[PDB]
């Protein structure tokens, strides 16, 4: 992230980056991350894996939105459902979305947010996904594969409908 438009680093230990005052991406957080998440005033923690975040969250007054998935199985239908739930969660306050390593599944949905919601073109979002410090491209084969060949116009159109 040297382009100021890319996600800014907050906590590289858990791969935590800021996309906006109301949206954060990261890897799997722990008990030590709770304090920081409350500074950022996170109200919703979206997870793309099965690990019950309520375990490390403790009695933190945040909503848990579990959306467990597999990057090699995601399609346009799942993406739209996630983007809608992310947007709705943003209206309630700042949101953290995460996975195991926060560069494949997270990198996929992050890039799609850039394209569908913020109106970035496909390659711009890709350049932030593969380069930006989230990981190396070997970790993102599934994510990279989907972003390419994804009908961005059909996604934006279907998004504008609902």
Numbering used by the authors: 34 to 195
Task: Pull text from the paper.
TpbA is a dual specific tyrosine phosphatase (DUSP) that has a conserved tyrosine phosphatase domain, and relevant phosphatase activities with p-nitrophenyl phosphate (pNPP) and phosphotyrosine peptides have been reported. TpbA (PA3885) from P. aeruginosa PA14 has been reported to be secreted to the periplasm and to link the extracellular quorum-sensing signals to EPS (extracellular polysaccharide) production and biofilm formation via negative regulation of c-di-GMP (3',5'-cyclic diguanylic acid), which regulates biological processes including motility and biofilm formation in bacteria. TpbA adopts a canonical eukaryotic-like DUSP fold with additional secondary structure elements that distinguish it from other DUSPs, including an N-terminal β-strand β0 that caps and extends the β-sheet, and a C-terminal helix α6 that packs on the outside of the protein. The active site architecture of the DUSP catalytic domain is defined by four loops: the protein tyrosine phosphatase (PTP) loop containing the conserved catalytic cysteine Cys132; the general acid loop containing a conserved aspartic acid that functions as a catalytic acid/base; a variable insert that varies among DUSPs and is predicted to involve in substrate recognition; and the α4-α5 loop that is equivalent to the Q-loop in protein tyrosine phosphatases (PTPs).
In an attempt to provide a structural basis for the phosphatase mechanism, we co-crystallised a C132S mutant of TpbA with pTyr on the basis that a C132S mutant of TpbA was previously reported to be inactive by Koveal and colleagues. The TpbA C132S mutant co-crystallized with pTyr shares the same crystal form as native TpbA with two molecules in the a.s.u. Comparison between the wild-type and C132S-pTyr structures reveal an r.m.s.d. of 0.35 Å for 162 aligned Cα atoms, indicating no major differences between the two structures. Close inspection of the electron density maps for the C132S-pTyr structure revealed phosphate alone was present in the active site. In one of the two monomers, however, clear electron density was visible for tyrosine in the shallow binding pocket approximately 5 Å from the bound phosphate, indicating that pTyr had been dephosphorylated. The tyrosine is trapped close to the active site, and its position overlaps with that of a glycerol molecule in the wild-type structure. The trapped tyrosine stacks adjacent to His76 and is coordinated by a 3.1 Å hydrogen bond between the carbonyl oxygen and the amide group of Ala104, and a 2.5 Å hydrogen bond between the amide group and the side chain of Asp175. The side chain of Asp105, the proposed general acid/base, is approximately 3.8 Å from the amide group of the trapped tyrosine, and a weak electrostatic interaction (3.6 Å) is provided between the carbonyl oxygen and the Nε atom of Arg138.
